[model samples]
Target: MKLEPEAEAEPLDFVVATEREFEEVLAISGGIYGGLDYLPSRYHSWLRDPDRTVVLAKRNGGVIALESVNVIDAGETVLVEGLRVAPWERGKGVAGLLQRFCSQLVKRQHPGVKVARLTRDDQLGPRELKKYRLITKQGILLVRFNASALLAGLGARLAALRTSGTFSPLPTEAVSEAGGDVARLLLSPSVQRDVLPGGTIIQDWQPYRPSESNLRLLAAKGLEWRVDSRARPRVLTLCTRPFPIPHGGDGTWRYLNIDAFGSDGAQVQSQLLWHLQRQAPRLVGLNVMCQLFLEPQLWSQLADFCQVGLGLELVKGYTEQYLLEADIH
Candidate 1:
């Protein structure tokens, strides 16, 4: 008698969650909470917003993966946010299915959305990379240097700029205004980051890195808000670390979406850039204004600095794919 062949198990179904389905869906796909428990609740609020789509795929009564697609109608672009699979089921094609399903969901919701963006780190292995290669061929992997190396190069350049007297850090009070102006000046047409609505605000803390603060804060050293006149003292000049030097195990500096130099920037653009160059050494690492497309002037300045020292942009290869036919009516 001929032996019977085993049936192939069917993959899970894809579904879109209503606001009511948020918690259950999160439990199945486990969002930021699954890994980094520290993410603020504001992120969840953003995910649940009407403008965003949170989708999931399930198999045999279990969630296999999740995907996020954000619609920015102002610029007519669709961003693929947080495409992830359950840690245990990652290599089982969950990520690929979730991506395809997300595309179909977006087409049904906002046909106007054009591009979807995602970042893949080296953290994903060869097999995962191979899977992504099958989907999209007309794509570019945006890359940048490691923050520490970039700043180190800038420090070396600062020494030269210092001799020329082009570098000088503004007073603490000036940081907020200067940072805002600098960020705006640096931003280019290609970068999607908007000028932080409120503008630049500077604060220095000593002793601890608190969960909440303004744009720039050097934690592990201490928590000292430069609110009063005394607060102003912490702001560094051409030769001081804005805060104490973080040695072996200080704290993570969470300076997000900040600006430094750009051609169309503030009246003191040259002075600010020079000051930053000179001061780059006092700190160990900083994510200063790396999204260069947003700021052509800053990118150029950084490039010039790279010429003086070892500078390397850290990049990871990632493959993205979507079902082409599912995207249309």
Candidate 2:
């Protein structure tokens, strides 16, 4: 054989990811997540983040696979995100080895890391299910529209709903920053039991347990936090700051991520509008591919709101993300 089967011929060499490998990583990750991949915007920043480490696996001198391990939940949990492998190198156990290596690395670095956590969008079969227990899951509602167009009608649609009194008004203003008693409110037992699914705060795309340290980690990322009332919170929502992506090749397209925690459709819709109306203006002239994760029951209701109510383009019909975890020891 002229070219050796390099990947399987030798043990994979792993190294920390760097800015120089961005294009190579992007090249192999093309069409990933159906073109909604977030790594492009976050690659550099992830390198600088203190609590996270991005690992790359190579057979010879080329990048073949990548995975990111993030320490959260007050150091008790390691959240794994952005696991990917090259096209030709898949099915050769490269991804599995990369993950195992990262797990061992994290355990050595953080002695308190009790479990490893990750979120997956694909099906989990019997073999796959044995590795981890399902913590919680959310139905994904992905949509896209020109920010300039959304800005024109979002306000009016919200105003009409306000006057129609279709739903009871939010008991209080939705808070964006962590201040005053906000952190305390989020860690309340009632909020944990009723609001957060499975007692886990799946912020943006990462799952974290409800703890002060986790809140600190999330708050630092500029995540938007909003709830019904400070005293008696019912529905809660978290929105990630808008980030640019390489979709459509126009440089104006971006992605907005939001996680809603509650069963009340009306209240959840209200909080969602509050998020859009706030971010839409800033994103004017730019397109936003928004991904909303929520309870399975609310998927269709919110999809209709985005499509028929707001005339936004529905990117996909229906999908789901499952948060899974396994003991590290």
Candidate 3:
């Protein structure tokens, strides 16, 4: 464990996590998932990844907080992931400290990282995050749909909904093409021109487009692709591993990041979800849930559709996923 400084009443000792602190870290993570053994490999794998770093905070020689940062998107962004603090230490300003320290770590170790992206699970006021100088940029809605319930309710409707043409499972060879399509869709005029509640431009990627390596890595990690190839193949749905939802280690709760796009987005979104339902029975051994982030307008559309769209429940955490930026001067 290493150390850093900021004058405070209960100042925490910041240190890079190592094998010596693995058990303590795991114990902290256990409180998060409600158990000790359910902690996923992805949560701790960064300790082994050469490109990533795991950090921890201690009080009275005990680990109290854990967080990590990886230079993702080829050094353009530092993804701050898996931030967990001991339940006993909640509301003690530990998170704000770790966030500030993580940003400073990024600047010191990887000066090229322009943005630090963090996904928060619990509801915290924007003003609280602003205290740490984190800019609240994106809103992530975690809508849950019971696979069987969804299939039963929306099956007929899904089949009846008409798109310009048919939806097909994208082959591995076409992944890059789909990736490019998604990148283009994110940059489209209608999407870019839209403004969120805070006057935030939803389209700024800060080098957000997935790279070839990212696509390949995602594919290798069981990422699935579905697309509606109607008139220039506009609609696409990418189903991949959830971005390490903090403290979300419930065994029955497997999360997926589903990105839906194109002009006929809503119907196609249904179709893609339908396809997921068909894939769900086999996935009974593993309950896979899909989550997505949408702009205000798109969110409105989905919210409207969800009213009658079969078991689709809206998850309220729009301001939680803050894309906090720190310039490396």
Candidate 4:
């Protein structure tokens, strides 16, 4: 079946474009839950890792698709971090052309990439790009922590046996009590030592604030005292946004972004959850989703939590690969 070039699917050659393409990507493919807010930073981080290529696809002269493939300077293969095409444009050859273009672009730019790896969310973006000849066989559980619980954990810490006189609340607090750090740690001379060691990371949608600044504050000299004296005692950095799940507008369930320490999956799962319970007692449920490749050890727990039995797996790689192969003749 060929794609239509109606105004909705207005045809234009897929070409590398800009960040705005991603914003449109989210609105069209199920909103924020489809995962656009997180792409830019991830893309920036991937690019800094070494030789990388990020390309976008445009239709009717507007960005309708985009993809990012990273090839470390001397690394053997590339990692396909991001790819998206407008929903109205699906089933047409647009996605395939975009995927093919990324491969060709990588070959010319890096010359040595053997494999192009990436994670595809089943609910978002294209499923299969056949040209890669890649297999789809796993999925990752996306997990979220409540911002309220995150704040409660800090209050509990201060009330505990450890007596640090500097344990005072900050002027501006994150939306929840899980924020706010111990004053002594905020005064330490070596700051990065703290920021790098913890499972906690920061998230920003607005200008940086101490409550929201994970690494950003540590990087600034003026905020050094606040950063140093603040406690890094916790391993989980939690951020929250409205759940994109269509629960019929019921606010009973919320969505959050969780980054934790131990870099070890098992430790992160148990420790983070246990800590979260203490921080937000009302949280009855939690959801964790990641690319299968991102969390091998944590998969079992995710399956158990989701009650995913046999025949259930979270696969990786581009979604376009599967879509084109399944829908194309």
Candidate 5:
């Protein structure tokens, strides 16, 4: 009753996701993410990850969907990633079935796993809200600019902000690989309650709990961590290394994702400037999309800076991404 004849009759087989099935998966995900798709750039890396499993659903030996499940928070939580259904099967129960299948698989492999968590920008209904606990949310600010073009005006623009008392000074410092010092700061009681939503770090679209193994896993994925102070931190940020995207041409477009946590406006801008300043010159792409995730209250002014102060193209007004968790059955 939930699906059509072709859907019910076609036997679905779950198989480990393969690097070769990318085209079919992409075909199913044709319209999603538009030019901002990351599956293509990160597919191979996803398969090779040690703690992650990318699974595919197939019928007649063709890919119908995909999901990558990674056990994090020291094997007690599972982070779900990259789920999409064939355009033909939209609105059916396939997504639920696929996730159920994967969760069962995850629970068997990691017995301690108790909850499933995922990041989503889609709208949620009352039923879904009742089922999943809202962990945290961030405002997404997407801006577009050419790397070389940005470099030309970035320095002067930032300086003007400085003269105008926008930022006091650059107190930011990089948290080195396997950062021992900031590691303690991040887990401290003050930061956990003040800076973070509840000892959870949501980078790009993935959520993780602060743990030793989790930190190492984050570092391996090229997440650049920055904090204003090591001994007494006020603002912290996580930046992903820029990666290429499809922009309708032979040349590649890049996505620079930054997550800022803290209430201080000047300090947050300082860290952001640090990331953009360092990354702009190194990129060779003519087009770049920069996304900065911030607290809801800070969204308007920072976005103002991008479009007016820095003269970058603002992609949208204000958007939100939520991190939700549900008890595993």
Candidate 6:
């Protein structure tokens, strides 16, 4: 069954973005290109891949909006990404129509994907979210900083801790045994407390078993393991290359999609962050778009570090990104 837009507004046609329209897709997606900094090539590749569903909206033969969804965690969750509407078309009921269409598409196209998810920065009132059946999992705090500022903020703290003989273990590259450690940690009570709200954890450990392949996947995606003196891993951080925004030229050595997990998440977070900051100048501008289950105090601590200590603005709206989901069955 196809979803229909509200009457009174002109009806628009929807189509799967074709390979030839990659440039046009980029143009209509200024909302995403400007916000998330995704490259045109990324869109091109996704459109070319058989495993993804990218939808575009057209009215009177011109593109107005677009969005995409791909299966994650072995088809248990459909990660919806890059939902955008043209700048000139805001408030004309495009986003809601596109989102509703995407949700319906997920159920019809991807049978096994039980849930659909996406992130948004703009505020959605309770009625609006209820209308879309989107759930607000939890809010996250966004922190961005340059290498120098991050290092400076953590340097004094690190030195003081080390001098006091309470230094935390540094982050270690994930190795053969690191997988086991991550598995055990994921099954721990402390880790359970750090899960995303609405029962959505980063990795679906629902079966509560992390196999060798799982560890390998995490490692390939830049997972770093850190443990305390007793050999207990207190922190796990995942890093990946930044999205190449055609507009953000000459940008490198920056961290993107970085996420941290641990009982002492903040301490472990700062330690791993400082470690990366010291690695090289390529780590120059640090941009972390990660979700956290941090204690209220830790959240404030991180905000202070980024804003006051590091001289960077603390961004927080999109971090409250709603994890919109729908039951496929």
Backbone clash count, each prediction separately: 20, 0, 0, 48, 0, 1
| Order of models, best lDDT first | 2, 5, 3, 6, 4, 1
Q: So what's the TM-score on candidate 4? A: 0.44
TM-score, one value per model: 0.41, 0.91, 0.65, 0.44, 0.92, 0.68
Error of 5 at 212 (Å): 1.1
lDDT for model 3: 0.55
Off by over 4 Å in 6: 1-11, 31-34, 39-41, 48-50, 121-124, 128-139, 148-184, 187-199, 203-220, 223-234, 246-255, 263-266, 278-280, 284-297, 307-321
Q: Judging by TM-score against the true structure, name the best candidate.
A: 5
Clashing pairs in 5: none
Whichever of 3 and 5 has more lDDT, that candidate is 5
Task: List the candidate 1 regions with Cα displacement exceeding 4 Å.
Answer: 1-10, 17-43, 73-75, 120-167, 170-329
RMSD of each: 12.9, 3.6, 6.9, 12.8, 2.7, 5.6
Poorest 10 consecutive residues of model 5 by lDDT? 243-252
Candidate with best lDDT: 2
> How many backbone clashes are present in model 2?
0
Kindly provide the TM-score of model 5 when superposed on the true structure, using C-alpha atoms.
Answer: 0.92
Write down the lDDT of every candidate, Cα atoms only.
Answer: 0.39, 0.84, 0.55, 0.40, 0.82, 0.55
Model 3, span 88-170: residue lDDT tens: 88898898889789878888888887666554435566765564445444445556655566545565654454342333223
Between which residue pairs do clashes occur in model 2?
none
On residues 1-329, what C-alpha lDDT tens digit does candidate 4 reach at each position?
Answer: 99986565455565544454555644544443344245533443434433556676766666667677655313455656556666776787777788778777877776655555543344432334433332232223444333444444544554441355422322321222324342233223333243322211222211111222323333432221111112333223333332333222333444333323223443343443343334344344433232222223445554443222111224332221111111111
lDDT of 1 by residue, 120-226 (tens): 32344566555442221111122333356656566566566677775433333333323343222223221112221112221210011112231122332222221
Candidate 6 on 10-90: residue-level lDDT in tens?
Answer: 677888888877777767765452454554647776766555789898887788888887766566767777777888888
